């Protein structure tokens, strides 16, 4: 099959109307607003009449408004906010007891008289949904639950007020969850309760609350639920028709687990027939069937379903098909043009529900994460209001061919449209709509001859407690944010004049019409003045898909090559082809590999050229990196094609990798501009050995850092992926890196070994396996710099990454993050999820959902957008992974695998696999493939489990899914890993936002994409930006006092200076996208091995280690035991003496004192220690006397990155204030 010939063909050729939609997707806000203002303009007379009507409605709303039930309960029992939240959580839990008499007995006999804890909230915290009840009680969203505060509050309120307050809480929650948040628990109950307002002139559309199917079984459940509801609604409608009678609303995401543009062929083949069958049933009963609008990247896909349905002759004669359009979206007027034309062509009077939109804060976050040009929604609330009124004018001009349905709770919006529609009205011309239990106060001033005599359809949620709680936060934020009408009308500090303000005239009078909100960053400006964010590509945009298709095809027609590019020019060598891992018939290019002799020559040439590159000023070296970033951004589509075909990656992952390469270049450039001066001299020639799994990004990151720190580079790319490396070198050279400063040496591991062994090699940057890093460490321990000090090694070496999930996590969120973390990139990320740990009480349900989601993945050659998982890199990798799977299977462990299509046979594929283990110790080696292991744990054994995760010795990435603050605090304080992720996936660390790198068996540090990286690549490290701490280690202070008491005044002063200079305790938040908090902290590394030679050297080593929070093991062969007598117990607790260093590890670093040959000997003994590669610092006794910084404190602390998804509860609290 020709490369990319079937990458992403659209469902149908795009008409002129469809292209106008796509053209507006991310149109600048200043371009969108002027035509909306023009379309929304009304005469002065109408505006005065509309303001008068709006004032009348608002005066009625404020005149009949009473205090809510929850407020009256809080008042009656003098509850604090936390007590109110806790009470509603208890009431929710008591309502999970189905039998009434049993529940009432538990309240009277167990709950009221004392400890609620012994009787409820065991496997499941009482407070799982406290973020939701927090919104109900306080109006404020808090993303995680302080379950210790709520437990204290519940104990306090029960001990104070007893059974009467529990009774009132239960009755209140019963009413709210059975009658307010839903019209009824079941469609039959909802229908029964609908007759009252139908007799007053309201109508209904029932919302069955399903969305976001994760498995085929979920989708089938939502389908049969919609089918049964249509029968009930149609029986009840009893021939009333689509305007007077009730209808149903559906969400397409409920009806297929892979509802996305990437899976468009499956959507049209599998989802469409299901909608058609439901529509045929709605037709037979003559009821409305409305398609709800969801995320912006589903809008245009949903239009293809609407088109086919409206043109399908089997549905003719029925006008009940309906469709939502969101006015906060920039495409809205163009979507309406398309729908109105479709209604004309089909002869169907499409029911068009105009809404503002329910996903605003999620759309802001997604555009920022994806680095896109602009948002697909407005960023000022008043812009959405003008858009709404402009689109209403368009709909009101077309009431002969569509049925407009104006869904809004805003009385100003309502009044404007009521007067815009004019005097002639009949039922069927248009209607308003509102939400059950929210809009009735307003629309009881609208419906009926005694009011405005306009009808209103009530959108009526129907479902159980579990179903309604799933996305209730999103629903509450619709009317509960600071800019929301409903919130403002309940604000006594908001005047009626402010509420009837005309958005159209206010926008017109702004100095810059349509300006972006001042407090929302465009994705390109996420980092402000520090650096320019890389830009991505929108794979839901048909223009982008069409242009990418052509650029990818053109990339496959190119003759890609990689050569040994020495300072003197290209070199000759053995030449072989490079094959596509997904199809070995696809020759991607040719590589000429380096001889060991030319590798040694290249190091000599780099040493010769080192002074000339060091002499380029840091600002100009940084300018080279910035130029290279511009070139990679411009070349991204071609680079994507090469990464897809050479490395076996999906287009989605290739985009993210090119972004990361750009980000490394710009980040290390900025860090250079912040730090490097004449005193930060380069190490010398640096050997950069890069992996095949990130063959552009990690390749570029290591090289850019070394180059910009002033070092010439020997770049040794992975044997499997030389072509993208050669292209990266071409770009850096074009950007101004001299050929003598950057030499490319393709080949296997003996090229890397020859480079590492060369006498002029001054440092090594390695990313790859622990075994190979260990062999490199042994090579380097043979050598010293010309100054007689160890050759620095930065080695990043993988992990055995775990995710812990408790019973408070939302299963659908968990499963999405697990599927991504374990199987993205065929599990070939060092960050990938390897062990999922499920709390026993929820393990079976989550495992069922996970296996169902597994079988929805598409595996194949990655030149198709529909492929989720590509090949593994080689046949040897495939064989290694499959041997592990079969060993587990042979031991009797449950193995789940997806079936592979026959087309995979021409490449090297491993199917995504789930293996159920009894305990974590059952997994003994790192399996670098799409293989997820699952274990279960009892909640009381959580702390032991964290110990088990730490006990492996790895410490790279780690995930935690929980809503509970006590569990977050416990787990994050006890886990020892470099990159922590809370309520999100554990992959795709972002440069400068989640600096990446771990500890123990996972690496030496410093973190890539972090502020300590460049300092390792110069002889004297600079002070990184923001790198300081006001905290002083108390054991350091006790040691300094002990030194003073022994009379060692000089060393006591040096100890106090180390205490001040240490950055232990640094605690920063890094700028990033909204809806996420990204934290960066400095901790102690662990136990540092001290190898002293003199008394003063030992005191200096101890001061450095203690100032950075570490414990120490001191070499007993030093003979210096008598120098450390009578230590304070606080210091003694941190001090041990070691005769057998191998028995007393693992260590987290080392400090060595001695002459050059002593240092070399100790360096070899340290390399021989089993376990982690130690970051070793050495100094002579004279150097310790002369240089207070002989041992650099930068390398005695451990960096930790933590990324918290603060939108995980369903919305963004910070953005509730942005309008
Ligand atoms: C009957 C009915 C059916 C609905 N069905 C859907 C649906 O299928 N899909 C869907 O997405 N929504 C749907 N909604 C929700 C709806 O879109 C609104 O979120 C909600 O009703 C609030 O809008 P409002 O006009 O009633 O109030 P208003 O308070 O006047 O408006 C609030 C809205 O303003 C917008 N907004 C807030 N801040 C900003 C900002 N900084 N920049 C730009 N815009 C901003 C948001 O859209 C927000 O919801 C429906 C609402 C109703 C009444
Ligand atoms: N930085 C990558 C992993 C890099 C690697 O695999 O070595 C991530 O966070 O997904």
Residue numbers in the entry: 15 to 1233
From the paper:
The bifunctional enzyme proline utilization A (PutA) catalyzes the two-step oxidation of L-proline to L-glutamate using proline dehydrogenase (PRODH) and L-glutamate-γ-semialdehyde dehydrogenase (GSALDH) domains. The two active sites are 42 Å apart and connected by a buried tunnel that is hypothesized to channel the intermediates Δ1-pyrroline-5-carboxylate (P5C) and/or L-glutamate-γ-semialdehyde (GSAL). The PRODH active site is located in a (βα)8 barrel, while the GSALDH module features Rossmann NAD+-binding and catalytic domains, which are both characteristic of the ALDH superfamily. Kinetic and conventional X-ray crystallography of PutA from Sinorhizobium meliloti (SmPutA) were used to capture high resolution (1.47–1.88 Å) structures of states along the catalytic cycle, including a novel FADH−-proline covalent adduct in the PRODH site, the intermediate P5C bound noncovalently in the reduced PRODH active site, the covalent acyl-enzyme intermediate of the GSALDH reaction, and noncovalent complexes of GSAL and the final product L-glutamate in the GSALDH active site.
The structure of SmPutA complexed with the product L-glutamate was determined at 1.50 Å resolution. The complex was prepared by soaking WT crystals with 325 mM L-glutamate. Electron density for the product is strong in both chains in the asymmetric unit, enabling modeling of the ligand at occupancy of 1.0. L-glutamate adopts an extended conformation, with its backbone interacting with the anchor loop, the side chain carboxylate in the oxyanion hole, and the aliphatic chain in the aromatic box. Cys844 in this complex exhibits χ1 of −69°, instead of the nucleophilic attack rotamer (55°), to avoid steric clash with the side chain carboxylate of the product. The interactions of the product are similar to those of GSAL in the noncovalent complex and the acyl-enzyme intermediate. Although we have focused on the enzyme-ligand complexes, the glutamate complex structure also reveals the conformation of the ligand-free, oxidized PRODH active site, which potentially provides information about conformational changes associated with the binding of proline. The conformational change of Tyr485 is striking, with the hydroxyl group of the side chain moving 14 Å. Conformational differences in the FAD are also evident and imply a crankshaft rotation of the ribityl chain upon proline binding to the resting enzyme.
